[PDB]
Amino acid sequence: KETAAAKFERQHMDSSTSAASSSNYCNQMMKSRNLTKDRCKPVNTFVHESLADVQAVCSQKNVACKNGQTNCYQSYSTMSITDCRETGSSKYPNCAYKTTQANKHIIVACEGNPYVPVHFDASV
Amino acid sequence: KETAAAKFERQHMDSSTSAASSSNYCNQMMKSRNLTKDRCKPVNTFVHESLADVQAVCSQKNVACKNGQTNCYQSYSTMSITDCRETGSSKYPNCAYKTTQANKHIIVACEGNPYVPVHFDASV
Ligand SMILES: [Cl-]
Ligand SMILES: [Cl-]
């Protein structure tokens, strides 16, 4: 079984690009990170910063999670992110995504020792 | 019982200001929109655009909702928004919120006739 920290890395980290460079970014990344294996994951955000910068958010601003838990943290700075969301034309196994690049604060849930991101809650 | 459309208006519309003007915006708005009545709503976004502009999103870009439903729409343009999230010092009945102003696309779920926003899904 994949650890929670490792799943977060796979689903939400893309440190190898500064930003989405085209409309096809999401189609490509959703496939390669294995998020379209048996069904199309409807919504998923990738963060274009170093793993260290994202892990650091776990010691930044403590805020409520949307679900009411108290282990969420909001980045002090904005980060480059890409939101991927299925389009109307999307139908497994032919998943199709809209790519939206933005620079926003991120909010992650953190857990464990070391205390690291395990869920992506939202961007602001 | 409040209708779904009316609840969306109460929870998510603030057309009377162009933007949050101070750190106390959320404390004030969460109280006055009756979102701290019996418990502190952990997270809530207000949109600083006309009701008509927000309703119009229901005929803009169709995208997946985070929960996998297909009735979500992403605004073509960015909108002024304020995210309100409970802080660590927050404890009912003394709710306390962090105010974060941003200009982002909004994503809403739409339902009914007329086809209007009934949930705020996310911002991008
Ligand atoms: Cl996500
Ligand atoms: Cl919200």
mmCIF file of C-alpha atoms and ligand atoms in Angstrom:
data_model
loop_
_atom_site.group_PDB
_atom_site.id
_atom_site.type_symbol
_atom_site.label_atom_id
_atom_site.label_comp_id
_atom_site.label_asym_id
_atom_site.label_seq_id
_atom_site.Cartn_x
_atom_site.Cartn_y
_atom_site.Cartn_z
ATOM 1 C CA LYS A 1 0.000 0.000 0.000
ATOM 2 C CA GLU A 2 1.244 3.478 -0.896
ATOM 3 C CA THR A 3 1.962 5.685 2.147
ATOM 4 C CA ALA A 4 -0.093 8.848 2.547
ATOM 5 C CA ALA A 5 2.981 11.032 2.058
ATOM 6 C CA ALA A 6 3.985 9.189 -1.086
ATOM 7 C CA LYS A 7 0.487 9.422 -2.526
ATOM 8 C CA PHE A 8 0.530 13.180 -1.961
ATOM 9 C CA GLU A 9 3.852 13.430 -3.817
ATOM 10 C CA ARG A 10 2.585 11.390 -6.752
ATOM 11 C CA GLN A 11 -0.729 13.218 -7.032
ATOM 12 C CA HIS A 12 0.347 16.781 -6.308
ATOM 13 C CA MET A 13 4.038 17.479 -6.930
ATOM 14 C CA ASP A 14 5.529 18.605 -10.247
ATOM 15 C CA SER A 15 8.851 20.318 -9.475
ATOM 16 C CA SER A 16 10.329 19.788 -12.953
ATOM 17 C CA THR A 17 8.493 22.651 -14.619
ATOM 18 C CA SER A 18 7.949 26.255 -13.540
ATOM 19 C CA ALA A 19 4.451 26.203 -14.977
ATOM 20 C CA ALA A 20 2.067 24.448 -17.336
ATOM 21 C CA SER A 21 3.385 25.317 -20.817
ATOM 22 C CA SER A 22 0.307 24.193 -22.781
ATOM 23 C CA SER A 23 -3.349 23.115 -22.764
ATOM 24 C CA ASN A 24 -2.268 19.454 -22.955
ATOM 25 C CA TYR A 25 -0.335 19.482 -19.665
ATOM 26 C CA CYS A 26 -3.154 17.919 -17.653
ATOM 27 C CA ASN A 27 -3.966 15.135 -20.094
ATOM 28 C CA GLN A 28 -0.307 14.148 -20.019
ATOM 29 C CA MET A 29 0.277 14.472 -16.270
ATOM 30 C CA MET A 30 -2.952 12.802 -15.179
ATOM 31 C CA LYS A 31 -2.029 9.774 -17.277
ATOM 32 C CA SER A 32 1.630 9.567 -16.221
ATOM 33 C CA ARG A 33 0.950 9.966 -12.513
ATOM 34 C CA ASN A 34 -1.479 7.055 -12.878
ATOM 35 C CA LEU A 35 -4.593 9.093 -12.083
ATOM 36 C CA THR A 36 -6.563 7.705 -15.048
ATOM 37 C CA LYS A 37 -5.918 3.987 -14.492
ATOM 38 C CA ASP A 38 -9.427 2.605 -13.907
ATOM 39 C CA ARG A 39 -11.394 5.853 -13.953
ATOM 40 C CA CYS A 40 -10.670 9.530 -14.575
ATOM 41 C CA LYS A 41 -9.875 11.371 -11.346
ATOM 42 C CA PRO A 42 -12.235 14.355 -11.718
ATOM 43 C CA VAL A 43 -10.088 17.126 -10.172
ATOM 44 C CA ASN A 44 -6.411 17.330 -9.275
ATOM 45 C CA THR A 45 -3.907 20.127 -8.563
ATOM 46 C CA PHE A 46 -0.152 19.974 -9.292
ATOM 47 C CA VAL A 47 2.270 22.274 -7.484
ATOM 48 C CA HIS A 48 5.290 23.629 -9.388
ATOM 49 C CA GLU A 49 7.660 24.190 -6.503
ATOM 50 C CA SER A 50 10.348 22.092 -4.857
ATOM 51 C CA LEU A 51 9.306 19.247 -2.606
ATOM 52 C CA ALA A 52 11.090 21.051 0.241
ATOM 53 C CA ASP A 53 9.041 24.226 -0.300
ATOM 54 C CA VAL A 54 5.789 22.281 -0.211
ATOM 55 C CA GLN A 55 6.834 20.256 2.848
ATOM 56 C CA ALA A 56 7.688 23.543 4.562
ATOM 57 C CA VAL A 57 4.059 24.605 4.427
ATOM 58 C CA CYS A 58 3.398 22.176 7.307
ATOM 59 C CA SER A 59 5.072 24.698 9.635
ATOM 60 C CA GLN A 60 3.425 27.794 8.161
ATOM 61 C CA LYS A 61 -0.088 29.186 8.845
ATOM 62 C CA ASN A 62 -2.400 26.763 10.685
ATOM 63 C CA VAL A 63 -5.958 27.051 9.261
ATOM 64 C CA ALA A 64 -9.119 24.952 9.297
ATOM 65 C CA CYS A 65 -9.529 22.286 6.611
ATOM 66 C CA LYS A 66 -12.765 22.347 4.601
ATOM 67 C CA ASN A 67 -13.828 19.194 6.464
ATOM 68 C CA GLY A 68 -13.354 20.836 9.880
ATOM 69 C CA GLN A 69 -10.088 19.159 10.854
ATOM 70 C CA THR A 70 -7.380 21.367 12.373
ATOM 71 C CA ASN A 71 -4.280 19.952 10.664
ATOM 72 C CA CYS A 72 -4.290 22.215 7.599
ATOM 73 C CA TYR A 73 -1.686 24.813 6.728
ATOM 74 C CA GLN A 74 -1.752 27.692 4.273
ATOM 75 C CA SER A 75 1.434 28.687 2.510
ATOM 76 C CA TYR A 76 2.701 32.137 3.391
ATOM 77 C CA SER A 77 3.601 32.766 -0.253
ATOM 78 C CA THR A 78 1.854 32.063 -3.512
ATOM 79 C CA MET A 79 3.096 29.103 -5.523
ATOM 80 C CA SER A 80 2.823 28.171 -9.175
ATOM 81 C CA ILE A 81 0.062 25.565 -9.545
ATOM 82 C CA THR A 82 -1.930 23.860 -12.271
ATOM 83 C CA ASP A 83 -5.514 22.744 -11.703
ATOM 84 C CA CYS A 84 -6.658 19.797 -13.816
ATOM 85 C CA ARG A 85 -10.379 19.169 -14.186
ATOM 86 C CA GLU A 86 -12.291 16.797 -16.442
ATOM 87 C CA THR A 87 -14.166 18.379 -19.340
ATOM 88 C CA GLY A 88 -17.599 17.493 -20.714
ATOM 89 C CA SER A 89 -15.980 15.510 -23.544
ATOM 90 C CA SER A 90 -14.194 13.354 -20.954
ATOM 91 C CA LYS A 91 -15.186 9.687 -20.853
ATOM 92 C CA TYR A 92 -13.003 6.847 -19.537
ATOM 93 C CA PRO A 93 -10.818 5.415 -20.948
ATOM 94 C CA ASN A 94 -10.541 8.595 -23.010
ATOM 95 C CA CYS A 95 -10.042 11.048 -20.161
ATOM 96 C CA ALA A 96 -9.878 14.738 -21.103
ATOM 97 C CA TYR A 97 -8.804 17.627 -18.869
ATOM 98 C CA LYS A 98 -8.857 21.400 -18.821
ATOM 99 C CA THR A 99 -5.535 22.879 -17.725
ATOM 100 C CA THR A 100 -5.649 26.057 -15.613
ATOM 101 C CA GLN A 101 -2.346 27.580 -14.471
ATOM 102 C CA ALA A 102 -2.327 29.998 -11.534
ATOM 103 C CA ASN A 103 -0.175 31.461 -8.795
ATOM 104 C CA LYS A 104 -1.958 30.974 -5.495
ATOM 105 C CA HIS A 105 -1.446 30.087 -1.838
ATOM 106 C CA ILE A 106 -1.867 26.394 -1.204
ATOM 107 C CA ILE A 107 -3.554 24.679 1.716
ATOM 108 C CA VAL A 108 -2.465 21.185 2.683
ATOM 109 C CA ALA A 109 -3.306 18.764 5.476
ATOM 110 C CA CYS A 110 -0.251 17.452 7.327
ATOM 111 C CA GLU A 111 0.334 14.273 9.314
ATOM 112 C CA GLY A 112 3.014 12.007 10.725
ATOM 113 C CA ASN A 113 6.618 12.047 11.886
ATOM 114 C CA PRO A 114 8.085 13.686 9.907
ATOM 115 C CA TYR A 115 5.083 16.011 9.730
ATOM 116 C CA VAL A 116 4.450 16.196 5.988
ATOM 117 C CA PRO A 117 1.633 16.915 3.518
ATOM 118 C CA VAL A 118 -0.914 14.110 3.064
ATOM 119 C CA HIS A 119 -3.812 15.939 1.386
ATOM 120 C CA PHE A 120 -4.253 18.920 -0.898
ATOM 121 C CA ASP A 121 -7.205 20.846 0.518
ATOM 122 C CA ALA A 122 -7.494 23.935 -1.694
ATOM 123 C CA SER A 123 -5.732 26.896 -3.249
ATOM 124 C CA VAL A 124 -6.352 30.558 -2.498
ATOM 125 C CA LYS B 1 -36.368 25.591 4.861
ATOM 126 C CA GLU B 2 -33.968 27.826 2.939
ATOM 127 C CA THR B 3 -33.787 27.029 -0.801
ATOM 128 C CA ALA B 4 -30.452 25.872 -2.190
ATOM 129 C CA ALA B 5 -30.136 29.004 -4.324
ATOM 130 C CA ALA B 6 -30.871 31.269 -1.388
ATOM 131 C CA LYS B 7 -28.368 29.476 0.822
ATOM 132 C CA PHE B 8 -25.700 29.967 -1.839
ATOM 133 C CA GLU B 9 -26.484 33.698 -1.947
ATOM 134 C CA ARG B 10 -26.299 34.041 1.824
ATOM 135 C CA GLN B 11 -23.099 32.035 2.193
ATOM 136 C CA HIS B 12 -21.167 33.188 -0.859
ATOM 137 C CA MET B 13 -22.261 36.562 -2.245
ATOM 138 C CA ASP B 14 -20.881 39.936 -1.149
ATOM 139 C CA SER B 15 -21.537 42.406 -3.985
ATOM 140 C CA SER B 16 -21.369 45.516 -1.780
ATOM 141 C CA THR B 17 -17.590 45.700 -1.617
ATOM 142 C CA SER B 18 -14.940 45.398 -4.326
ATOM 143 C CA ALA B 19 -12.658 43.543 -1.948
ATOM 144 C CA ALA B 20 -11.906 42.739 1.674
ATOM 145 C CA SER B 21 -10.575 46.023 3.106
ATOM 146 C CA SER B 22 -9.134 44.580 6.337
ATOM 147 C CA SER B 23 -8.120 41.515 8.364
ATOM 148 C CA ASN B 24 -11.425 41.689 10.275
ATOM 149 C CA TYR B 25 -13.639 41.222 7.202
ATOM 150 C CA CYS B 26 -14.184 37.508 7.794
ATOM 151 C CA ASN B 27 -14.995 37.750 11.489
ATOM 152 C CA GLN B 28 -17.641 40.324 10.631
ATOM 153 C CA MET B 29 -19.116 38.603 7.571
ATOM 154 C CA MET B 30 -19.186 35.100 9.032
ATOM 155 C CA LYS B 31 -21.195 36.426 11.970
ATOM 156 C CA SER B 32 -23.613 38.579 9.954
ATOM 157 C CA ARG B 33 -24.373 35.920 7.361
ATOM 158 C CA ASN B 34 -25.253 33.644 10.285
ATOM 159 C CA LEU B 35 -22.402 31.194 9.693
ATOM 160 C CA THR B 36 -21.345 31.150 13.365
ATOM 161 C CA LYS B 37 -24.759 30.528 14.950
ATOM 162 C CA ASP B 38 -24.270 27.172 16.703
ATOM 163 C CA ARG B 39 -20.744 26.368 15.543
ATOM 164 C CA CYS B 40 -18.033 28.079 13.507
ATOM 165 C CA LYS B 41 -18.244 27.153 9.826
ATOM 166 C CA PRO B 42 -14.599 26.184 9.204
ATOM 167 C CA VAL B 43 -14.135 27.507 5.638
ATOM 168 C CA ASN B 44 -16.184 29.856 3.481
ATOM 169 C CA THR B 45 -15.563 31.959 0.352
ATOM 170 C CA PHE B 46 -17.307 35.264 -0.474
ATOM 171 C CA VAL B 47 -17.447 36.544 -4.048
ATOM 172 C CA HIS B 48 -17.204 40.303 -4.668
ATOM 173 C CA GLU B 49 -19.073 40.529 -7.942
ATOM 174 C CA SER B 50 -22.686 41.178 -8.872
ATOM 175 C CA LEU B 51 -25.215 38.423 -8.360
ATOM 176 C CA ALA B 52 -25.810 38.482 -12.126
ATOM 177 C CA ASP B 53 -22.111 37.895 -12.862
ATOM 178 C CA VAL B 54 -21.999 34.915 -10.521
ATOM 179 C CA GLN B 55 -25.262 33.465 -11.866
ATOM 180 C CA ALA B 56 -23.808 33.797 -15.365
ATOM 181 C CA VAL B 57 -21.094 31.298 -14.521
ATOM 182 C CA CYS B 58 -23.736 28.549 -14.847
ATOM 183 C CA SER B 59 -23.523 28.986 -18.635
ATOM 184 C CA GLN B 60 -19.732 29.251 -18.818
ATOM 185 C CA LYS B 61 -17.136 26.421 -18.793
ATOM 186 C CA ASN B 62 -18.539 23.020 -17.760
ATOM 187 C CA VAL B 63 -15.969 21.183 -15.571
ATOM 188 C CA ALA B 64 -16.002 18.273 -13.136
ATOM 189 C CA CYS B 65 -16.831 18.997 -9.492
ATOM 190 C CA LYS B 66 -14.376 17.710 -6.877
ATOM 191 C CA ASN B 67 -16.984 15.106 -5.899
ATOM 192 C CA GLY B 68 -17.259 13.778 -9.470
ATOM 193 C CA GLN B 69 -20.583 15.364 -10.400
ATOM 194 C CA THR B 70 -20.828 17.017 -13.824
ATOM 195 C CA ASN B 71 -22.842 20.136 -12.955
ATOM 196 C CA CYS B 72 -19.918 22.440 -12.144
ATOM 197 C CA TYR B 73 -18.899 25.525 -14.077
ATOM 198 C CA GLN B 74 -15.704 27.552 -14.042
ATOM 199 C CA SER B 75 -15.877 31.280 -14.609
ATOM 200 C CA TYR B 76 -14.190 32.464 -17.777
ATOM 201 C CA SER B 77 -12.769 35.472 -15.928
ATOM 202 C CA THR B 78 -11.184 35.921 -12.543
ATOM 203 C CA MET B 79 -13.335 37.457 -9.829
ATOM 204 C CA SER B 80 -12.524 39.231 -6.593
ATOM 205 C CA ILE B 81 -12.998 36.767 -3.722
ATOM 206 C CA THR B 82 -12.266 36.496 -0.020
ATOM 207 C CA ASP B 83 -11.527 33.148 1.613
ATOM 208 C CA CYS B 84 -12.419 32.903 5.302
ATOM 209 C CA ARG B 85 -10.878 30.115 7.357
ATOM 210 C CA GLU B 86 -10.881 29.483 11.096
ATOM 211 C CA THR B 87 -7.602 30.102 12.908
ATOM 212 C CA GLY B 88 -6.023 28.083 15.715
ATOM 213 C CA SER B 89 -7.297 30.606 18.278
ATOM 214 C CA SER B 90 -10.858 29.981 17.061
ATOM 215 C CA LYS B 91 -13.227 28.376 19.560
ATOM 216 C CA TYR B 92 -17.031 28.675 19.499
ATOM 217 C CA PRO B 93 -18.707 30.903 20.516
ATOM 218 C CA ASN B 94 -15.604 33.025 19.962
ATOM 219 C CA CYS B 95 -15.047 32.226 16.297
ATOM 220 C CA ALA B 96 -11.919 33.700 14.692
ATOM 221 C CA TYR B 97 -11.082 33.806 10.980
ATOM 222 C CA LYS B 98 -8.157 34.536 8.710
ATOM 223 C CA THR B 99 -9.116 36.762 5.786
ATOM 224 C CA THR B 100 -7.407 36.085 2.441
ATOM 225 C CA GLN B 101 -8.341 38.278 -0.535
ATOM 226 C CA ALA B 102 -7.601 37.050 -4.058
ATOM 227 C CA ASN B 103 -8.606 37.385 -7.685
ATOM 228 C CA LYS B 104 -9.337 33.929 -9.040
ATOM 229 C CA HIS B 105 -11.677 31.951 -11.283
ATOM 230 C CA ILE B 106 -14.559 30.463 -9.361
ATOM 231 C CA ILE B 107 -16.143 27.050 -9.751
ATOM 232 C CA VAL B 108 -19.765 26.572 -8.758
ATOM 233 C CA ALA B 109 -22.276 23.739 -8.959
ATOM 234 C CA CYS B 110 -25.545 24.716 -10.645
ATOM 235 C CA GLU B 111 -29.056 23.305 -10.367
ATOM 236 C CA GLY B 112 -32.706 24.053 -11.029
ATOM 237 C CA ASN B 113 -34.944 26.153 -13.245
ATOM 238 C CA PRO B 114 -33.666 28.817 -13.391
ATOM 239 C CA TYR B 115 -30.279 27.096 -13.511
ATOM 240 C CA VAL B 116 -28.389 28.884 -10.742
ATOM 241 C CA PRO B 117 -25.462 28.335 -8.356
ATOM 242 C CA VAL B 118 -26.166 26.044 -5.388
ATOM 243 C CA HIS B 119 -22.643 25.195 -4.193
ATOM 244 C CA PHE B 120 -19.244 26.851 -4.198
ATOM 245 C CA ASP B 121 -16.798 24.132 -5.222
ATOM 246 C CA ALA B 122 -13.420 25.885 -5.399
ATOM 247 C CA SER B 123 -11.432 28.805 -6.746
ATOM 248 C CA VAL B 124 -8.574 28.653 -9.228
HETATM 249 CL CL CL C 1 -6.652 18.455 -5.817
HETATM 250 CL CL CL C 2 -16.511 27.840 0.463
#
